[PDB]
Amino acid sequence: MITRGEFFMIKEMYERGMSISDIARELGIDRKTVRKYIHSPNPPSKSKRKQRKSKLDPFKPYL
DNA sequence: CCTTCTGGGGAATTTTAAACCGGCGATTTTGGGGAAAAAATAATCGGCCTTGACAGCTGCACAGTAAGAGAATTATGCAGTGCTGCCATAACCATGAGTGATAACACTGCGGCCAACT
């Protein structure tokens, strides 16, 4: 979940010719994570989750 | 008057410094698996801050359009009646097939009789 700026920085510094491992060191990210993000379309910073059960569900129709 | 010393130059050789390229040893990095920790997200909890309402109640008036409710009128479909013709059914006889009936034995249902308890 590296933010827009983090992903932009990773992609740019990698494409400039800078080595990937020291890129990860500089940005404080795991080498596997950085390498995976190298070949990625756009910055991933969103997680989608659907609704979940609550306590007032059985009573909701009655209310 | 003569001899010896020295110096310059061209060629041959040697050594050391520098740079490249290859080989060898070390660390790094990538990938996968397992555990631990952090953070993010959602849900649930308590509580503070702020304000609306409760103060008789709302039914009516006008505007225009549309609908509808009741009564009178009209159209139409059903019904009723008479006369004639055609189709259906019914009546009889014959023959075949199905079912209700009859005999016999076995099992079960109902009515008459005896006994036990209150």
PDB file of N, CA and C (backbone and C1' of nucleotides) in Angstrom, chain A residues 21 25 31-32 35 47 49 52-55, chain B residues 28-33 41-45:
ATOM      1  N   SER A  21      18.015  -2.420  -4.812  1.00  0.00           N
ATOM      2  CA  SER A  21      18.174  -2.713  -3.391  1.00  0.00           C
ATOM      3  C   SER A  21      18.410  -1.444  -2.580  1.00  0.00           C
ATOM      4  N   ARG A  25      16.310   0.363   0.390  1.00  0.00           N
ATOM      5  CA  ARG A  25      16.923   0.876   1.610  1.00  0.00           C
ATOM      6  C   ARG A  25      16.548   2.336   1.839  1.00  0.00           C
ATOM      7  N   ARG A  31      12.624  -5.420  -0.148  1.00  0.00           N
ATOM      8  CA  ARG A  31      13.110  -5.565  -1.516  1.00  0.00           C
ATOM      9  C   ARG A  31      12.096  -6.296  -2.387  1.00  0.00           C
ATOM     10  N   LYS A  32      11.455  -7.333  -1.845  1.00  0.00           N
ATOM     11  CA  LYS A  32      10.430  -8.038  -2.606  1.00  0.00           C
ATOM     12  C   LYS A  32       9.271  -7.113  -2.947  1.00  0.00           C
ATOM     13  N   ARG A  35      10.396  -4.649  -5.684  1.00  0.00           N
ATOM     14  CA  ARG A  35      10.529  -5.324  -6.972  1.00  0.00           C
ATOM     15  C   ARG A  35       9.166  -5.646  -7.568  1.00  0.00           C
ATOM     16  N   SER A  47      -7.798  -0.440  -0.469  1.00  0.00           N
ATOM     17  CA  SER A  47      -8.286  -1.782  -0.179  1.00  0.00           C
ATOM     18  C   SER A  47      -9.799  -1.730  -0.041  1.00  0.00           C
ATOM     19  N   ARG A  49     -13.318  -3.432   1.018  1.00  0.00           N
ATOM     20  CA  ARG A  49     -13.969  -4.417   1.870  1.00  0.00           C
ATOM     21  C   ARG A  49     -15.462  -4.134   1.912  1.00  0.00           C
ATOM     22  N   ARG A  52     -20.139  -5.777   6.926  1.00  0.00           N
ATOM     23  CA  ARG A  52     -19.977  -6.887   7.852  1.00  0.00           C
ATOM     24  C   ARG A  52     -21.130  -6.893   8.843  1.00  0.00           C
ATOM     25  N   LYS A  53     -21.294  -8.032   9.507  1.00  0.00           N
ATOM     26  CA  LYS A  53     -22.382  -8.202  10.459  1.00  0.00           C
ATOM     27  C   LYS A  53     -22.176  -7.309  11.679  1.00  0.00           C
ATOM     28  N   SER A  54     -23.290  -6.865  12.261  1.00  0.00           N
ATOM     29  CA  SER A  54     -23.254  -6.040  13.457  1.00  0.00           C
ATOM     30  C   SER A  54     -24.132  -6.640  14.546  1.00  0.00           C
ATOM     31  N   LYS A  55     -24.324  -5.912  15.648  1.00  0.00           N
ATOM     32  CA  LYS A  55     -25.123  -6.406  16.764  1.00  0.00           C
ATOM     33  C   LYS A  55     -26.606  -6.125  16.602  1.00  0.00           C
TER      34      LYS A  55
ATOM     35  P    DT B  28      26.781  -7.160   2.080  1.00  0.00           P
ATOM     36  O5'  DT B  28      25.938  -7.371   0.740  1.00  0.00           O
ATOM     37  C5'  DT B  28      26.463  -6.906  -0.496  1.00  0.00           C
ATOM     38  C4'  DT B  28      25.502  -7.178  -1.634  1.00  0.00           C
ATOM     39  C3'  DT B  28      24.045  -6.876  -1.328  1.00  0.00           C
ATOM     40  O3'  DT B  28      23.398  -6.406  -2.495  1.00  0.00           O
ATOM     41  C1'  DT B  28      24.277  -9.189  -1.762  1.00  0.00           C
ATOM     42  P    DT B  29      21.992  -5.641  -2.407  1.00  0.00           P
ATOM     43  O5'  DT B  29      21.010  -6.591  -3.232  1.00  0.00           O
ATOM     44  C5'  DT B  29      21.434  -7.122  -4.483  1.00  0.00           C
ATOM     45  C4'  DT B  29      20.578  -8.302  -4.884  1.00  0.00           C
ATOM     46  C3'  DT B  29      19.107  -8.162  -4.507  1.00  0.00           C
ATOM     47  O3'  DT B  29      18.279  -8.684  -5.528  1.00  0.00           O
ATOM     48  C1'  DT B  29      19.976 -10.111  -3.520  1.00  0.00           C
ATOM     49  P    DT B  30      16.873  -7.993  -5.877  1.00  0.00           P
ATOM     50  O5'  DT B  30      16.035  -9.180  -6.544  1.00  0.00           O
ATOM     51  C5'  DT B  30      16.706 -10.211  -7.271  1.00  0.00           C
ATOM     52  C4'  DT B  30      16.189 -11.579  -6.869  1.00  0.00           C
ATOM     53  C3'  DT B  30      14.705 -11.612  -6.498  1.00  0.00           C
ATOM     54  O3'  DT B  30      14.025 -12.557  -7.301  1.00  0.00           O
ATOM     55  C1'  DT B  30      16.016 -12.708  -4.836  1.00  0.00           C
ATOM     56  P    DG B  31      12.424 -12.537  -7.404  1.00  0.00           P
ATOM     57  O5'  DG B  31      12.009 -13.951  -6.799  1.00  0.00           O
ATOM     58  C5'  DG B  31      12.790 -15.103  -7.096  1.00  0.00           C
ATOM     59  C4'  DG B  31      12.459 -16.231  -6.145  1.00  0.00           C
ATOM     60  C3'  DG B  31      11.078 -16.128  -5.508  1.00  0.00           C
ATOM     61  O3'  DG B  31      10.486 -17.405  -5.395  1.00  0.00           O
ATOM     62  C1'  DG B  31      12.692 -16.201  -3.811  1.00  0.00           C
ATOM     63  P    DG B  32       8.892 -17.558  -5.308  1.00  0.00           P
ATOM     64  O5'  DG B  32       8.687 -18.624  -4.136  1.00  0.00           O
ATOM     65  C5'  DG B  32       9.583 -19.725  -4.010  1.00  0.00           C
ATOM     66  C4'  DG B  32       9.605 -20.244  -2.587  1.00  0.00           C
ATOM     67  C3'  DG B  32       8.285 -20.102  -1.839  1.00  0.00           C
ATOM     68  O3'  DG B  32       8.058 -21.240  -1.028  1.00  0.00           O
ATOM     69  C1'  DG B  32       9.964 -18.935  -0.664  1.00  0.00           C
ATOM     70  P    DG B  33       6.581 -21.602  -0.520  1.00  0.00           P
ATOM     71  O5'  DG B  33       6.786 -21.868   1.042  1.00  0.00           O
ATOM     72  C5'  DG B  33       7.945 -22.562   1.495  1.00  0.00           C
ATOM     73  C4'  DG B  33       8.177 -22.324   2.972  1.00  0.00           C
ATOM     74  C3'  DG B  33       6.911 -22.110   3.790  1.00  0.00           C
ATOM     75  O3'  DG B  33       7.043 -22.720   5.059  1.00  0.00           O
ATOM     76  C1'  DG B  33       8.271 -20.181   3.950  1.00  0.00           C
ATOM     77  P    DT B  41      -7.549   2.309   6.079  1.00  0.00           P
ATOM     78  O5'  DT B  41      -8.948   1.539   6.105  1.00  0.00           O
ATOM     79  C5'  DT B  41      -8.977   0.112   6.048  1.00  0.00           C
ATOM     80  C4'  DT B  41     -10.002  -0.445   7.015  1.00  0.00           C
ATOM     81  C3'  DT B  41     -11.212   0.460   7.246  1.00  0.00           C
ATOM     82  O3'  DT B  41     -12.394  -0.295   7.179  1.00  0.00           O
ATOM     83  C1'  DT B  41     -10.281  -0.151   9.313  1.00  0.00           C
ATOM     84  P    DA B  42     -13.744   0.339   6.589  1.00  0.00           P
ATOM     85  O5'  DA B  42     -14.885  -0.468   7.360  1.00  0.00           O
ATOM     86  C5'  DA B  42     -14.653  -1.818   7.756  1.00  0.00           C
ATOM     87  C4'  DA B  42     -15.039  -2.026   9.205  1.00  0.00           C
ATOM     88  C3'  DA B  42     -16.318  -1.302   9.627  1.00  0.00           C
ATOM     89  O3'  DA B  42     -17.181  -2.201  10.278  1.00  0.00           O
ATOM     90  C1'  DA B  42     -14.590  -0.851  11.162  1.00  0.00           C
ATOM     91  P    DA B  43     -18.766  -1.961  10.286  1.00  0.00           P
ATOM     92  O5'  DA B  43     -19.196  -2.447  11.744  1.00  0.00           O
ATOM     93  C5'  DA B  43     -18.466  -3.489  12.391  1.00  0.00           C
ATOM     94  C4'  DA B  43     -18.316  -3.197  13.867  1.00  0.00           C
ATOM     95  C3'  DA B  43     -19.542  -2.551  14.504  1.00  0.00           C
ATOM     96  O3'  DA B  43     -19.798  -3.123  15.763  1.00  0.00           O
ATOM     97  C1'  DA B  43     -17.662  -1.208  14.909  1.00  0.00           C
ATOM     98  P    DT B  44     -21.303  -3.300  16.288  1.00  0.00           P
ATOM     99  O5'  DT B  44     -21.164  -3.127  17.869  1.00  0.00           O
ATOM    100  C5'  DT B  44     -19.964  -3.525  18.526  1.00  0.00           C
ATOM    101  C4'  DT B  44     -19.508  -2.465  19.510  1.00  0.00           C
ATOM    102  C3'  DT B  44     -20.638  -1.775  20.277  1.00  0.00           C
ATOM    103  O3'  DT B  44     -20.442  -1.936  21.662  1.00  0.00           O
ATOM    104  C1'  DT B  44     -19.112  -0.174  19.399  1.00  0.00           C
ATOM    105  P    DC B  45     -21.681  -1.867  22.678  1.00  0.00           P
ATOM    106  O5'  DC B  45     -21.177  -0.836  23.785  1.00  0.00           O
ATOM    107  C5'  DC B  45     -19.833  -0.902  24.244  1.00  0.00           C
ATOM    108  C4'  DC B  45     -19.337   0.465  24.670  1.00  0.00           C
ATOM    109  C3'  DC B  45     -20.393   1.348  25.330  1.00  0.00           C
ATOM    110  O3'  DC B  45     -20.089   1.518  26.697  1.00  0.00           O
ATOM    111  C1'  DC B  45     -19.060   2.570  23.744  1.00  0.00           C
TER     112       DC B  45
END
